[PDB]
Symmetry: C2
Subunit: 172 residues, 2 copies
């Protein structure tokens, strides 16, 4: 299937930004396959507020890292196996009650409990980069992730209000 | 290549809406292939203003029809061969100086001269439907077009600010 490149050029901004109507979402999960040799970068960022309520999933030292900041919880966590072996890996990020679950190749590798109150009119999902400077993360990293993404599904497509790509979505 | 369906269900609204930054456009042309048995419908609508400055390309009696309303020109024109034979046809709509050109299967079939002043911050392109009730056209038609679209390219992708799909883009 058609794989896209997770970072154009110098990796300063996301390849794509989706905007979702929060009252319309009935699917609170995302899933995709990624392939990379890059140990560090952003895979995707999500927010309901860029100052207040945000999430990032990336790689640090080859392994998944989640940063989360909202009314309930503020955290920086690494978990799961290294993904930076150049092989395709399946990833799923799900909200299940008040938890956020991370699954890798079908196996749960992480569960952040007591982090989310009820699913802030709009949620944005940014692929390959953040919607704020990396310096404002809890723990900065260099956002550019040189890898591929394919078979991706972001929340509930029925609730997507719009999608923007700043430049050209490149092939992998 | 992947063809999409030009009308979901009862054909009241477009399948997809693209928004473009008018100062950024350097390509003032659009092109696509269509396949249909339906003699009447909208193929695409474009506006810089839904009251003031709009364009529609559709079929009426099987044949291309353009409606255009702007500061320079107000018109309803039919031209070209019937397209409602269920075969793939190549269509290109281009602005060339102050004209709007329509080409079918590589051949110019229509040139609307003296219709456009210089290429209103934003242009919208709506596929398969209008962004106003069909009753407000110069000459109403029933907008639903049961056909396929593939190999489509809309203006200058570098100038696209966002794209929205209200429901599910179906396969053809
Ligand atoms: C991980 C989730 C939920 C699961 C998913 O598909 C992606 C998405 C990313 C944005 C997160 C969201 C869970 C709830 C959060 C953390 C909000 O509190 C603010 C950002 C939201
Ligand atoms: C046909 C054009 C120009 C060529 C094209 O690719 C599609 C686009 C549709 C909107 C039209 C535009 C030409 C200029 C118009 C007619 C403006 O005056 C208002 C709507 C614009
Ligand atoms: Ca990197
Ligand atoms: Ca019809
Ligand atoms: Zn909040
Ligand atoms: Zn794996
Ligand atoms: Zn005007
Ligand atoms: Zn033909």
């Amino acid at each position: 299937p058609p794989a896209v490149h997770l970072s154009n050029g110098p990796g300063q901004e996301p390849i794509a930004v989706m905007t979702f109507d929060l009252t319309k979402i009935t699917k609170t999960s995302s899933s995709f396959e990624v392939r990379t040799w890059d140990p560090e970068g952003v895979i995707f960022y999500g927010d309901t507020n860029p100052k207040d309520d945000w999430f990032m999933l990336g790689l640090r030292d080859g392994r998944p890292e989640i940063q989360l900041h909202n009314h309930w919880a503020q955290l920086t966590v690494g978990a799961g196996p290294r993904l930076d072996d150049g092989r395709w890996h399946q990833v799923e990020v799900k909200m299940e009650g008040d938890s956020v679950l991370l699954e890798v190749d079908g196996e749960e590798v992480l569960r952040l409990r007591q982090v989310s109150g009820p699913l802030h009119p709009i949620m944005r999902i940014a692929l390959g980069g953040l919607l704020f400077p990396a310096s404002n993360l809890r723990l900065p990293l260099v956002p550019a992730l040189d890898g591929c993404l394919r078979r991706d599904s972001w929340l509930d497509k029925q609730a997507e209000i719009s999608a923007s790509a700043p430049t050209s979505l490149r092939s992998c």
